[PDB]
């Protein structure tokens, strides 16, 4: 254990690049606790593999720097996230957001595109549903649409991640279609789930009207209100909230789709590290000050949820690290990783002060981005960037000839802090995380 | 701190994919020891990042399987390995074998291509020179040429990794050239270093004659003999060795260059996963039965070295994982990872039985290979493989339009077992490893 893992001094001198100030043995032995966790905060950086963590650190903090949030969790390991082929039931080495999110929130592997159901299309309870049933307060925050697979997996059981609202569900998930006697679209099941705090984007799907049931004819936004949900649409009003519970659930819709990314930079190009000058990221001017940052949502959710005496389970997702990775946009991708680090600092500060909180930071799968040599002549999309070290770092995206770079199957880092954090060390599976949380809370 | 990390049962069923059988807390707390290490075995998988480990596991053992050696080390972490730019002294995000090997064996960062010297070209003692001085037995094994960067870094101090023997040193490392008053080429410094056990390839540089000094005119191979080295060139003779020490140092030269790779498979190609059938690796027919495997060399080295009462330091390197990665050859690369896993099992079996041995498995840097979806249309070199799961796994190499795929800068896995293993957990730097070993052995 250690809180400062930055290089000690002059990285060109003996011992200057070291991150360790002493022996971790005792410190580590002290952070090993099997006492129950009262709360759990699971932070997910979408598509944030080791490569993404390194690129952002090199850029934002420098090679020898360290993320005060992301790099500060003492217990580390690597975990696998392979999905399953629906027909064969054999492994599918590269998972999507849905199958992986389902794995950690359910404890069962599934096929790509599935939310809350195994390869047989059978429903399985998510950790959020189990926490709510035990009396704990529940939160779900993300910078993406709330209907995205990661936040949706905790509250929805759909056969296809594309079944956002009533209209998509009728054509793509008919067995789930409300009219067909199913539980409903992702959005409808989210509304039913009734988590205490739900914050993110995806307001546009709420403008759809239910095709059947008690709120038929009424838009989903209207139904939320009729059901007792407090709706907030910006930083100001969010901030104004004083409580959120089963009588007064909070629902923040901060964008029609995904919330705007924090940084602006050009898209990587073929031979860009050669033909184009080094870029320096800038703030995204299209992003309004009224739009909450992930740390803000995380912080507000912790405040409201910490009022519950039994404890709480909260999931936070920095979604656009993945989206900008697909877009081959280094600046957008790094900004979203810096953004998530902030949300991680908020969680850590709370956890260190409370003492019964298990904080976990990981990703759903690996992605395309690679850090290559400045002079690299690659076949894909590349870009040179000016880092905090005053050096150029080149990033490469070369696994797709399409407009979207692809996920990768490499095992990746999973880090934790708090009671039961030891269960994250060594090699584990994404499904283990579910059992780790279920047992830390004693949610059996 | 478990030994079996394979999926529990049916990966399609709830909990079937889990690798954990219980709670690691107690087990982990028990494997944390700060008592001094009597011995240390450092295994290096060249260019063996997390992606490489995953691809080989998926192929050789199946997605839900586990490397009995590589994946069985309980204390895990991620470490950085950026090099330095010689001019500026600023970070160079993607290191080579030379700059990284120098970092863990010396504790100082350096520029790419440097062996045993910092950016000012100043010499720094290596962990092997320090162990030998304290009376410990020393071993150095690799599947590559012994003049090659990783093994050379422990015994040579050269400004350019290209200074193999007398002839190359005169033109490329004149300040080290023996005639110019320098310490000599890599091969000459290796001969001088006099480690108890040195096994590998690179016999061809030993056919060069020294240009000055006591053994001038005499080939390097003749010099070795004149200096009291026992030369063995195949498995049978290796095996026949009964002792190796300072009076009778062992020198195994099993190949002119790098030792032959274990598996054969075709080179990945543009749209190979689409236009070509899935391949299944086979054993390399050019590889002679008389050529020792890494595990055999590792095993024999442990045997000879464990006779020293003070203890020993042994470094083992599975070098061709990297070379095949550069070559865009999945089968050669996976075979070399399986090869290394066996050497790791040997190290672990000894360590678990001896009890004062620190075993560390890591890599010098990340590489090109990525696991992508079966249908991926990538701009680079791809290939489909038939895995143990009876499923297809696609591998992609898309960071170079040249004939050699490039290294990548992503932080990677470092795993350890034994006294002082806790110093590997969390985020660390490649230079910390040096301090971890120095302190474990009390080599102050
Ligand atoms: Zn994702
Ligand atoms: Zn994605
Ligand atoms: Zn290497
Ligand atoms: Zn290499």
CSV table of N, CA and C in Angstrom, one decimal, chain B residues 117-171:
chain,number,residue,atom,x,y,z
B,117,UNK,N,24.4,1.1,-19.0
B,117,UNK,CA,24.9,2.5,-18.8
B,117,UNK,C,23.7,3.4,-18.8
B,118,UNK,N,23.8,4.6,-18.1
B,118,UNK,CA,22.7,5.5,-18.0
B,118,UNK,C,22.7,6.4,-19.3
B,119,UNK,N,21.9,7.5,-19.3
B,119,UNK,CA,22.0,8.3,-20.5
B,119,UNK,C,23.3,9.1,-20.7
B,120,UNK,N,24.1,9.2,-19.7
B,120,UNK,CA,25.4,9.8,-19.8
B,120,UNK,C,26.5,8.9,-20.2
B,121,UNK,N,26.1,7.6,-20.5
B,121,UNK,CA,27.0,6.5,-20.9
B,121,UNK,C,27.8,6.0,-19.7
B,122,UNK,N,27.4,6.3,-18.5
B,122,UNK,CA,28.1,5.9,-17.3
B,122,UNK,C,27.6,4.5,-16.9
B,123,UNK,N,28.5,3.7,-16.4
B,123,UNK,CA,28.3,2.3,-16.0
B,123,UNK,C,27.7,2.3,-14.6
B,124,UNK,N,26.8,1.3,-14.4
B,124,UNK,CA,26.1,1.1,-13.1
B,124,UNK,C,26.1,-0.4,-12.9
B,125,UNK,N,26.5,-0.8,-11.7
B,125,UNK,CA,26.5,-2.3,-11.4
B,125,UNK,C,25.1,-2.9,-11.5
B,126,UNK,N,25.1,-4.1,-12.1
B,126,UNK,CA,23.9,-4.9,-12.3
B,126,UNK,C,23.6,-5.8,-11.1
B,127,UNK,N,22.4,-6.2,-10.9
B,127,UNK,CA,22.0,-7.0,-9.8
B,127,UNK,C,22.8,-8.4,-9.8
B,128,UNK,N,23.2,-8.8,-10.9
B,128,UNK,CA,24.0,-10.1,-11.0
B,128,UNK,C,25.4,-9.8,-10.5
B,129,UNK,N,26.1,-8.7,-10.9
B,129,UNK,CA,27.4,-8.3,-10.4
B,129,UNK,C,27.4,-8.2,-8.9
B,130,UNK,N,26.3,-7.6,-8.4
B,130,UNK,CA,26.1,-7.4,-6.9
B,130,UNK,C,25.8,-8.7,-6.2
B,131,UNK,N,25.1,-9.7,-6.8
B,131,UNK,CA,24.9,-11.0,-6.1
B,131,UNK,C,26.2,-11.8,-6.1
B,132,UNK,N,27.0,-11.7,-7.2
B,132,UNK,CA,28.2,-12.4,-7.3
B,132,UNK,C,29.2,-11.9,-6.3
B,133,UNK,N,29.2,-10.6,-6.1
B,133,UNK,CA,30.1,-10.0,-5.1
B,133,UNK,C,29.7,-10.4,-3.7
B,134,UNK,N,28.5,-10.6,-3.4
B,134,UNK,CA,28.0,-11.0,-2.0
B,134,UNK,C,28.3,-12.5,-1.8
B,135,UNK,N,28.7,-13.2,-2.8
B,135,UNK,CA,29.0,-14.7,-2.6
B,135,UNK,C,27.9,-15.6,-3.1
B,136,UNK,N,26.8,-15.0,-3.6
B,136,UNK,CA,25.7,-15.8,-4.1
B,136,UNK,C,26.1,-16.4,-5.5
B,137,UNK,N,25.4,-17.5,-5.8
B,137,UNK,CA,25.6,-18.1,-7.1
B,137,UNK,C,24.8,-17.4,-8.1
B,138,UNK,N,25.2,-17.3,-9.4
B,138,UNK,CA,24.5,-16.5,-10.4
B,138,UNK,C,24.2,-17.3,-11.7
B,139,UNK,N,23.0,-17.2,-12.2
B,139,UNK,CA,22.7,-17.9,-13.4
B,139,UNK,C,22.0,-16.9,-14.4
B,140,UNK,N,22.1,-17.2,-15.7
B,140,UNK,CA,21.6,-16.4,-16.7
B,140,UNK,C,21.2,-17.3,-17.9
B,141,UNK,N,19.9,-17.5,-18.1
B,141,UNK,CA,19.5,-18.3,-19.2
B,141,UNK,C,18.5,-17.6,-20.1
B,142,UNK,N,18.6,-18.0,-21.4
B,142,UNK,CA,17.7,-17.4,-22.4
B,142,UNK,C,17.6,-18.3,-23.6
B,143,UNK,N,16.5,-18.1,-24.4
B,143,UNK,CA,16.4,-18.9,-25.6
B,143,UNK,C,17.0,-18.2,-26.8
B,144,UNK,N,17.5,-17.0,-26.6
B,144,UNK,CA,18.0,-16.2,-27.6
B,144,UNK,C,19.6,-16.2,-27.6
B,145,UNK,N,20.2,-15.4,-28.4
B,145,UNK,CA,21.6,-15.3,-28.4
B,145,UNK,C,22.0,-14.7,-27.1
B,146,UNK,N,23.1,-15.1,-26.5
B,146,UNK,CA,23.5,-14.6,-25.2
B,146,UNK,C,23.9,-13.1,-25.3
B,147,UNK,N,24.2,-12.7,-26.5
B,147,UNK,CA,24.7,-11.3,-26.8
B,147,UNK,C,23.5,-10.4,-26.8
B,148,UNK,N,22.4,-11.0,-26.8
B,148,UNK,CA,21.1,-10.3,-26.9
B,148,UNK,C,20.8,-9.5,-25.6
B,149,UNK,N,20.2,-8.3,-25.8
B,149,UNK,CA,19.9,-7.4,-24.7
B,149,UNK,C,19.5,-7.8,-23.3
B,150,UNK,N,18.5,-8.7,-23.2
B,150,UNK,CA,18.1,-9.1,-21.9
B,150,UNK,C,19.2,-9.9,-21.1
B,151,UNK,N,19.7,-11.0,-21.7
B,151,UNK,CA,20.8,-11.6,-20.9
B,151,UNK,C,22.1,-10.8,-20.8
B,152,UNK,N,22.4,-10.0,-21.9
B,152,UNK,CA,23.6,-9.2,-21.9
B,152,UNK,C,23.6,-8.1,-20.8
B,153,UNK,N,22.4,-7.5,-20.5
B,153,UNK,CA,22.3,-6.4,-19.6
B,153,UNK,C,22.8,-6.7,-18.2
B,154,UNK,N,22.9,-8.0,-17.8
B,154,UNK,CA,23.3,-8.4,-16.5
B,154,UNK,C,24.8,-8.5,-16.4
B,155,UNK,N,25.5,-8.6,-17.5
B,155,UNK,CA,26.9,-8.8,-17.5
B,155,UNK,C,27.7,-7.8,-18.4
B,156,UNK,N,27.1,-7.0,-19.2
B,156,UNK,CA,27.8,-6.1,-20.0
B,156,UNK,C,27.4,-4.6,-19.9
B,157,UNK,N,28.3,-3.7,-20.2
B,157,UNK,CA,28.1,-2.3,-20.1
B,157,UNK,C,28.6,-1.8,-21.4
B,158,UNK,N,27.6,-1.6,-22.3
B,158,UNK,CA,27.9,-1.2,-23.6
B,158,UNK,C,26.9,0.0,-24.0
B,159,UNK,N,27.4,0.9,-24.8
B,159,UNK,CA,26.6,2.1,-25.3
B,159,UNK,C,25.6,1.7,-26.4
B,160,UNK,N,25.9,0.6,-27.1
B,160,UNK,CA,25.0,0.1,-28.1
B,160,UNK,C,24.8,-1.4,-28.0
B,161,UNK,N,23.5,-1.8,-28.0
B,161,UNK,CA,23.2,-3.2,-27.9
B,161,UNK,C,23.8,-4.0,-29.1
B,162,UNK,N,24.2,-3.3,-30.1
B,162,UNK,CA,24.7,-4.0,-31.3
B,162,UNK,C,26.2,-4.4,-31.2
B,163,UNK,N,26.8,-4.1,-30.1
B,163,UNK,CA,28.2,-4.5,-29.9
B,163,UNK,C,28.4,-5.9,-29.3
B,164,UNK,N,28.0,-6.8,-30.1
B,164,UNK,CA,28.1,-8.3,-29.8
B,164,UNK,C,29.5,-8.8,-29.5
B,165,UNK,N,30.4,-8.7,-30.5
B,165,UNK,CA,31.7,-9.2,-30.4
B,165,UNK,C,32.7,-8.1,-30.7
B,166,UNK,N,34.0,-8.5,-30.8
B,166,UNK,CA,35.1,-7.6,-31.1
B,166,UNK,C,34.9,-6.7,-32.3
B,167,UNK,N,34.5,-7.3,-33.5
B,167,UNK,CA,34.3,-6.5,-34.7
B,167,UNK,C,33.3,-5.4,-34.7
B,168,UNK,N,32.1,-5.7,-34.1
B,168,UNK,CA,31.0,-4.7,-34.1
B,168,UNK,C,31.3,-3.6,-33.1
B,169,UNK,N,32.0,-4.0,-32.0
B,169,UNK,CA,32.3,-3.1,-30.9
B,169,UNK,C,33.3,-2.0,-31.4
B,170,UNK,N,34.3,-2.4,-32.2
B,170,UNK,CA,35.3,-1.5,-32.8
B,170,UNK,C,34.6,-0.4,-33.5
B,171,UNK,N,33.7,-0.8,-34.4
B,171,UNK,CA,33.0,0.3,-35.2
B,171,UNK,C,31.8,1.0,-34.5
